[PDB]
C-alpha cells in the first residue's frame, strides 16, 4: 500500500510548537492538542504502544511545565503522580482522543 510517493503544501505536527504554548503559530484553536490526535493516527498505524510516544515529546512541555511552574502553587501536590492529571491535557485529550469519532471542539 502507498508505493507511489505524493506531497503537497499542508500543515505538519512539527510547525506546531511544544505543549509549552503558540504565541502566533495558533491561536484561535489549539494546535497542541489539535495534532495530539493527528501524531497518533499516523504512528499508531504501525504501532500503537509507540502512538504515545509521538505526543509523549510534546505533551513534556505542560508534563514539566505544570509540576516546575505549578510548583510555586504549593509546591508539595506538584510532583510526576499529580501532574499526570493535575493539568488539563489529561482531560482535553481525553475528549478528542476518545471523542474523537467525531472531532467538532476544533
Given at each position: 500500500k502507498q508505493q507511489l510517493q505524493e506531497h503537497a503544501p499542508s500543515h505538519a505536527n512539527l510547525d506546531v510548537k511544544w505543549l509549552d504554548g503558540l504565541r502566533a503559530g495558533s491561536m484561535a484553536l489549539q494546535g497542541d492538542v489539535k495534532v495530539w490526535m493527528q501524531n497518533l493516527e499516523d504512528l499508531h498505524t504501525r504501532r500503537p504502544d509507540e502512538f504515545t510516544a509521538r505526543l509523549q515529546q510534546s505533551t513534556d512541555a505542560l508534563y514539566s511545565h505544570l509540576e516546575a511552574q505549578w510548583a510555586?502553587?504549593?509546591?508539595?501536590?506538584?510532583t510526576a503522580s499529580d501532574v499526570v492529571g493535575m493539568p488539563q491535557w489529561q482531560e482535553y485529550t481525553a475528549m478528542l482522543r476518545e471523542r474523537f469519532a467525531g472531532l467538532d471542539t476544533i
Open positions: 510555586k502553587q504549593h509546591g508539595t501536590p506538584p
